[model samples]
Target: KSIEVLTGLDPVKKRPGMYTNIENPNHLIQEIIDNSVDEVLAGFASKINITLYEDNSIEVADDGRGMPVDIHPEHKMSGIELIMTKLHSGGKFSNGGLHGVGVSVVNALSTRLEAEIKRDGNVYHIVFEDGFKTKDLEIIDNVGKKNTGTKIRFWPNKKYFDDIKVNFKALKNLLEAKAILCKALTIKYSNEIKKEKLTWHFETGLKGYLDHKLEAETLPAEPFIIDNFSNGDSYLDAVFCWCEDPSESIKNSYVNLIPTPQDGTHVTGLKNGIYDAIKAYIEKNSIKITANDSFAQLNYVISVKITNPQFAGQTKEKLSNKDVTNFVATAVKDLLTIWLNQNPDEARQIVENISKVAQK
Candidate 1:
């Protein structure tokens, strides 16, 4: 992807509609789900339930971590207020929201929007219509049951979105991708008017993800999974496997559990290390390889957790930290190389399978 340097609100001015694509109700549904996924990644909640109501309204509820409702000292308003009124205010970007305009854009684009946050054993509710506050923020008595999370109900402004209508199929497809990205997340989608419901969940995390992606093919060896925490508040969790299927030879990468649309330094490192480990193994074992002989084919899934993630830009399309890439790549190379030596049979099978892939 080309990096277009956006400055002086160029992002908001030229591409305000690009953030959520308000013209497309389907995109609006995805925007909300993206936020729910972010909450799950933060370890706030595990289950997300979405409903397309009959009255042209949409509601998304998550059992994961809820947003903080306390007041922001600098903003002189509740965190919820800042989240809705201020553009670029969110926890996803260090600057807030994907574009730093905050979810308030969603609020501003809606005919009616209500946020109900359950946190610290209380329910905080706020309502808005057409970018204007309909009621003051209120703290209500415990409703129904005690649980921590949030529920947002919104009805997009028909005036702003002239021909907007929900596309159920498109929404489901996006949710499926999200489900794959956050392997353990449970996503439920339903449209009461149409009597449709779809549920997706994967408990085995990325290992399950690898199997789902390669189940039809023959395995080179059982997946070699590695998980370890490095010093200084960083963690690496990875899954490596080789498939007889030549089409699936490269590994995938994610950061903080969100599938990176573009690979970062961490992914580059992992790929380099894995390739090197295979080369070293072949030389040390004196494996027969003609000049044209290829090495083992490898596919990888690597994820990392960082306290301070330096994203490439406001949209956070890529990660910019050179040190993190080196850290993950070096660690993967060192650990996998050691594992191959300790487990010779598995190593041999992986190498042979990869060699065949290379020939093709």
Candidate 2:
């Protein structure tokens, strides 16, 4: 019997599919960008600037606390090198970026990469090629030290992907959604390939998202909103309203800023909360309408932040955390019940809308 040891970037290069989806190189780019978004979630960053070059390279820069350039006590390497070379070595133990298979995989699968850091009143730079460090960390004397950030530029290895080009609209929407979720965070995207530039920032957050999507009048003239209701480290945010058009319903849910297109237990909790609240309202007012009829034309956005979030798979298209369902349901139900009680006129309008919906 023979024992083998595969270290650092070896496992990633040998089995890329286990670490990431290889169909499109954009996933690799997203892995890098996700780290910056994680910084936004942690309040260390406010702006993320992304550039798509014509030369098949992408650069993601953030005005966050830059990757530390200090040497690690055990690793015998800089913190930046450890993050770029070693898997599962990052500050976000309970946060974002695929639970640690993000930037390292990008480093492993990239033909060339350059990392620049501004921290501790100094600037540092390093380079890598073919999944290994080629240029050692060095300080740059000319750069200013007042501004701190990290900039990563990489060319995705052509052999690993079917499509070298990214879907522009998909990337744009994803970045915009991140901006909407993070409230004050700004994302500036410049595509040299398409000769386009855009910026995204939503100060009003989820409410701003609903405002943009609504093109027609809605009942109550105000959406039901529950912002940052928490139990321990887990918290949830939601905004929803009843609209006139059945075709205009928009239901989007997210866990830790990751979009769950298929939805999950959190959405189930949202529906249950709405049902519970409306049922209570009907009973109190003696209205002859069911909870289901009020939701005939509902538009909602649910976002939750939890310390440990379990997903269906690496793609994270669905959330599988069972506890989140009940946690969100109770909070939404309790809050919405109060909202209905405080706004009797809107409550009556909602019941009337449901009555009209039942008649149709």
Candidate 3:
């Protein structure tokens, strides 16, 4: 037998699990949405529109610079075609999506994909079927040079997924989180199938999100917040509040906008910081309590952005970068320690709450 070669989108079709989750189309759709959010992150765009059509197709549009439609010097194909058909082809360094494979994988998994670019006073359109370019790039219309953006409409192949239907709640929550993370960016979601429309724009960032999520009374009122805590090229943002009811507690962690439900070292670093800071106060006040008691009722959201993030798998459920552990730990520890020392009254109340929980 001859050696088989799987290049471009072939590998994606052969093994879908290697690129994204096959349980639902939500993750596949998210890959495309993340690219638009990247434009917002780079200050190129502000508005993102997502539509779930009655035909079970999805459309994502952004007011960012439209994708390059010119021919690649080396590949001899239009930049749009190259990006959609090939693997490891993208323009990003500090990215929220999976660098090169983000949109490409989405293109590969979709049965029919169309890209429309509005730039340089013209609209260019291209189509792909089963990950292969079916129509060459063409100038469809003239829109004037002032407008620029990219729109992608894709129909997810039902055979590859266990459930072809997207979970709207999960999609909304993810978009809401993205809006919270990317300050001032407006995300509009229109579900034509459900006849529902929702918009998210959070200028106040993570602290505001924390306040909204907290329904139970907090021990010290305000949440301990760290916004844009920078270390080298990586950045960390987090918010924490101690809740009175443990059942109301929530913990969410993300790496470069990708949710980490299983968590990872970054979360470990957060726990280490919290335990250390609260332990110091407990020991100083001579309060008798175990470390677990300190976190009886806690809610936190941690988000990190780095040049290159390492995840446990393509699903990106957990972060595994060894260096990130200390990078996050040191910053969190220092800030929390300073906060405890400066706000002794609030710190004492937190300790007392822990003490009461320990006794019970």
Candidate 4:
């Protein structure tokens, strides 16, 4: 038997549903695991582990707060039950998972699945086969466990998934994205079947992410970092770096811990604020920048945390709330203006670079 790899248009369109329900191989399965890892980073969790066993079963374990074990007052079943058995029933809808379908979809596509959660010093286990519950949830009294967290082990159904094998490179890339997004979170990966292991523990947060992305180029200046809270509720953390790489510019934007590709209101505001700050600095310093070129020369990574985030789609790929846009723009502009004033030399150099680009 030989492996056949297909390329081009057909594979690109079909790969998403075959992998992540999205068109980006951003490795959907690994992204699911990363979602759980993010919880641990926000101080909402403690330990997380993923095991790729030889038997084609994957397990994701976390020591953070487990899914609510108590019966959902409205659903009349335990939170886990509603989440696994029902579609769109996970915590991500409330900043918890990817569209809240991570676990359920995994269950639906798996042949055998088991979810074991330890909460409030109790152990609970539920088993499923072929997307249907095969065994009722049971509480085991003698299970040795104390902390609160969750563990999900699943064997993908070969009959449903033409290829249920785990891809090592795909897993690595996904973990790297998670590490970049949640820089303080310590993430570890182990492919027991393949004898592969990797770990990432970054404490500097997004600044570190900027450094990693711009590793091949020279920074026009050290990262300009900002962390501020607005209206006493919304929080913003952002980093800006100017790179010497003229071929490509990088912008990584997130809202309430979720990475967005199409960008949302927050990203728009961030761009506007940075542009405004640069223009203001130029005008204030009597700097000359030509009108023919773009004044925006820096890349940014902006992250925001809000009590309620209004995403643009069911996939939550973008933020749509107008107020969030205004709030973020105002906050970023104000903070950047202050930072420019405090670091005049760096600001002036940046302006000089922009002016040169504008002149050309």
On TM-score, the candidate that comes out on top is 3
Candidate 1 residue lDDT tens string, 32-130: 666776677666778889999988789999985566777889768787776776554224333223422446666767788998888776788889876
lDDT of each: 0.68, 0.80, 0.81, 0.66
Model 3 TM-score?
0.83
Error of 2 at 31 (Å): 2.1
Model 3 gets an lDDT of: 0.81
lDDT of model 4, residue 113: 85
Clashes of 3: 1
Better of 1 and 4 by TM-score: 4
Cα error, candidate 2, residue 85 (Å): 1.8
Model 2 TM-score?
Answer: 0.81
Give all candidate RMSDs, comma-separated. Answer: 5.6, 5.1, 5.0, 8.0
> Weakest 10 consecutive residues, lDDT, candidate 3?
90-99
What is candidate 3's lDDT per residue for 1-360, written digit by digit as tens?
133222488778888877777888898888888787667656688999999998889999999989998888978998899878877632224232232355889888899999999999999999999989999899999997878899999999987888888889999988998888767589999999899999998777876566677766775578889988997678898998788876566799987776787788888888877777787766676646665776566789998877556666445578888888888888987898888888888888887777788898
For candidate 3, list the clashing residue pairs, or say none.
121-144
Rank the models by TM-score, top first: 3, 2, 4, 1
TM-scores for candidates 1 onward, in order: 0.74, 0.81, 0.83, 0.79
Q: Is candidate 3 or candidate 4 better by TM-score?
A: 3
Give the poorly placed runs of model 2, Cα more than 4 Å off: 1-7, 14-18, 21-23, 89-100, 142-146, 214-220, 228-235, 287-297, 320-323, 345-360
Worst 10 residues of 1 by lDDT: 1-10
Tell how far residue 306 is off in model 1, in angstroms.
3.3
